[PDB]
Design a protein around this nucleic acid. Structure first.
Lengths: 21, 95, 79, 97, 97, 97, 79, 94, 97, 21
DNA sequence: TATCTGACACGTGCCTGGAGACTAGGGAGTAATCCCCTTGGCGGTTAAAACGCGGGGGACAGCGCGTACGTGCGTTTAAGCGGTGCTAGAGCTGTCTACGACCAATTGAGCGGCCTCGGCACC
DNA sequence: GGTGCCGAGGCCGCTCAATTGGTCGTAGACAGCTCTAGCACCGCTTAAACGCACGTACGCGCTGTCCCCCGCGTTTTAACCGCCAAGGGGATTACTCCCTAGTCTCCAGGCACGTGTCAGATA
């Protein structure tokens, strides 16, 4: 009856310096 | 006489039945969730105590817990965390 | 005489789990060495913990406490 | 009347208050701190439990095993950053591809 | 083809989540280790869950180190892992220092 | 002789222990960084001690990262370092996650 | 364009102190990126610290606490 | 207008007892003060956690000794526990 | 008569006693803990001071600088293990071959 | 009048499995 | 070698912190008992660890090159000393009203011990 | 396809703690004032960053040469399940002893403020 509302994305590789955009 | 153990299995089962009415849970998963919530509580309490002692104060209030959960949890999670905390505290203070 | 309980089938299985396609002949010795070092460290910590409480039996609580103090928290075994 | 019902939460508040009192953290404990911590813990538990339930339902399985918990934890960057040094018993590893 | 069988067994071992080391040799090894750190006028006993937890932690650490050294070997334009790769991995990891 | 000049510069910069980054550009950079952290109507002011401490910490961190990158480049049987070595060092370090 | 304040001779001197003999042309960008990331994290922690205390001047104690909480203890400025 | 306490005089006296003719700067003094404060804090929290583990409510010499043995390395802790026991048996002689 | 002179220690005893009593560590405080902690701290301080003085005398200097402290720290295995994640201001890195 | 008593050894390379001997 | 500069080292004032004595009350050490678990061995049994041998995919050394890199010099820009002025904000101090700990009663709350029931591999 | 094994899941009591109400010591929010380092600007000059030209040197691709993990086949030592059995010891309960927080009173100890003074930079 309850669901989450936050954004969920795949784990990012910090060593390549990705951007969320 | 066998002493009673203080666990969080009942509340975890309650929130599970609230979220998923059909999905069950095992015992190892319950122990893992209990250890996780205990570690999170200990971390938050220690951070709040240290941050309150930094300001030469002897009283822990909602501001210290808010700053602790904002420092420990990432920003995306801390936003919803402090939102739910403010909602709960204002619902409690409303009555 | 006792470190030989980690014969190369187990190390090969662990490497396949880790995603290794080719293993040399000089990897098993270093694997055993680092495993023995980690075991010595964790066992020293657990023995100190169980000796502080004046006990002669090592429980899982002392083990998980030593693992948490080292910097590797373990879940599923209580504590 | 329990404070948990007044606050609208599910996790207990009196137990958390007693722990904060006899936890050797400070000389005085506020009134709005236990409910805040309880709400935060309940939110985190509900989030991780919903993630584990979704991961278990993805494999058309009813029971929840530590493998589903590991799959749900390692697939979220926020939970991976929060839980980066802990290990799950019998959780396995993530596949290469 | 050996590469096909290699990838097949890699996927099979990554899908599983159980232990890959026997229990009696590990128990004998941990007993010898805990006897090396204990004087002769006393002996320390061991439980059942403590050995399992220690073994799980050891396998997790070994899998992590093996993945790191495999990445290090793959960086050097080769597939076969060498002792120098694991040496440099353990050195750059910063642990035990 | 380029190798002699390189060795002489390495020795000279390893013997010295002073600051290596200018103070005014670093202060302007840290101010521009802290500008977009807070809101717009109000800002914050910085002290010299905090700025110089942060500068020394960043210098030490960058020196450690460069040393690790140099070790990783030496592992590949070459002298010139590349961005791939720094990326691999950051990945193996395991920090920021 | 304040990130351009870190000139190439500064990075070259840092690499020389670290022990690098030859530097390529793509190291400066990654160095600036990692420096910006570390600065962002540390400054975010310091601003949180100085904002909890309802103050308007960031002191060295806040930066020291932010460095200590992240696992990098700094000596010579306080504590 | 508010004075603070530091471990300056004691460290200076220890240095004079060790080396008869040797100076020191403010940076080295602050570094040593921060180091001794961090060590004291670490030992204190370790002893507190060890006492809370066994459902205890007191901090005796046994807990501090175990915390020192668990924090310091082999020879360092071996010498530290010896010095501590010597000081304890010297102070107890009343 | 002060308690520090009774046990033959240069570092204070009542000061650290009040520090650990007002630090929210336990409900009660023993009698042999402050003297033990004082002795341990004094031993550590004496050791590090002797090492720094020897390092300063090796360079025919009359005063101790953070460079000598960094050298004495990095020239000992136990001190490096105890202070692995600790940096020294104005200390720099140590030379190597 | 105060001299060190504990033994002092150079930093050992733990990555090469060096022993104290 | 004569002269100016700055940080290290030694002398006062004293007040807030350190030292000494009586009380009592809860906390840690000492005995005593029981039953869950552990160490040690035996019968078996097949799953899995051990060892010999072929050949092929993979690791390593040598050679040619050409494209990125460090060296060298004319030249422009922004770091830094140093004044000058402004000021918002750090820091110390007096009031007291509201928030928190403590004590007696108690009742509805959460856990240990039955009993049931469905999922699954089995013969 | 019928059936026994086993792990979740719902009752039945039952006991130790969250609630409630009243009292009193206390603490930091607020308002007030004072003094300082951060902020911005100015003048200027010399250390240091920049762009352009070029020899060079080594990372890389290609070739060839060894070569030692790997799979296949045969033989075997110990891993484990079930059963046996004694006892060392952790958990639990009483019990008498004493360590220290509390309070009060009295007094020495190190920090802030003067006052030199010689190694080092400058001429």
């Amino acid at each position: 009856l309850r669901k989450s509302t936050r954004v969920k994305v795949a784990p990012l590789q910090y060593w390549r310096n990705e951007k969320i955009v | 006489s066998k002493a009673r153990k203080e666990t969080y299995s009942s509340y975890i089962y309650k929130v599970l039945k609230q979220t998923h009415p059909d999905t069950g849970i095992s015992q190892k998963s319950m122990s893992i969730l209990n250890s996780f919530v205990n570690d999170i509580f200990e971390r938050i309490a220690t951070e709040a105590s240290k941050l309150a002692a930094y300001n030469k104060k002897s009283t822990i209030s909602a501001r210290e817990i808010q700053t602790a959960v904002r420092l420990i949890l990432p920003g995306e999670l801390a936003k919803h965390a402090v939102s739910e905390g403010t909602r709960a505290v204002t619902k409690y203070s409303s009555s | 005489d006792n470190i030989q309980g980690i014969t190369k089938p187990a190390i090969r299985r662990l490497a396949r789990r880790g995603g290794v396609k080719r293993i040399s002949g000089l990897i098993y010795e270093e694997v055993r060495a680092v495993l023995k070092s980690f075991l010595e460290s964790v066992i020293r910590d657990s023995v100190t913990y169980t000796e502080h409480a004046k006990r002669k039996t090592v429980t899982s609580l002392d083990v998980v406490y030593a693992l948490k103090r080292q910097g590797r928290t373990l879940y599923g075994f209580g504590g | 009347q329990s404070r948990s019902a007044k606050a609208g939460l599910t996790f207990p508040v009196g137990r958390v208050h007693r722990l904060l009192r006899r936890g050797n953290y400070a000389q005085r404990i506020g009134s709005g701190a236990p409910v805040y911590l309880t709400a935060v813990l309940e939110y985190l538990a509900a989030e991780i439990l919903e993630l584990a339930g979704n991961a278990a339902r993805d494999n058309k399985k009813t029971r929840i095993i530590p493998r589903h918990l590991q799959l749900a934890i390692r697939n979220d960057d926020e939970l991976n950053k929060l839980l980066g040094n802990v290990t799950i018993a019998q959780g396995g590893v993530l596949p290469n591809i | 083809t050996p590469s096909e069988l290699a990838l097949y067994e890699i996927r099979k071992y990554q899908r599983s989540t159980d232990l890959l080391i026997s229990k009696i040799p590990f128990a004998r090894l941990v007993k010898e280790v805990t006897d090396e750190f204990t004087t002769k006028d006393q002996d320390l006993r061991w439980q059942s869950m403590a050995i399992m937890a220690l073994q799980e932690a050891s396998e997790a650490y070994l899998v992590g180190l093996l993945e790191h050294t495999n990445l290090l070997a793959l960086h050097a334009k080769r597939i076969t892992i060498m002792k120098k790769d694991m040496q440099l991995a353990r050195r750059i990891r910063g642990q035990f220092i």
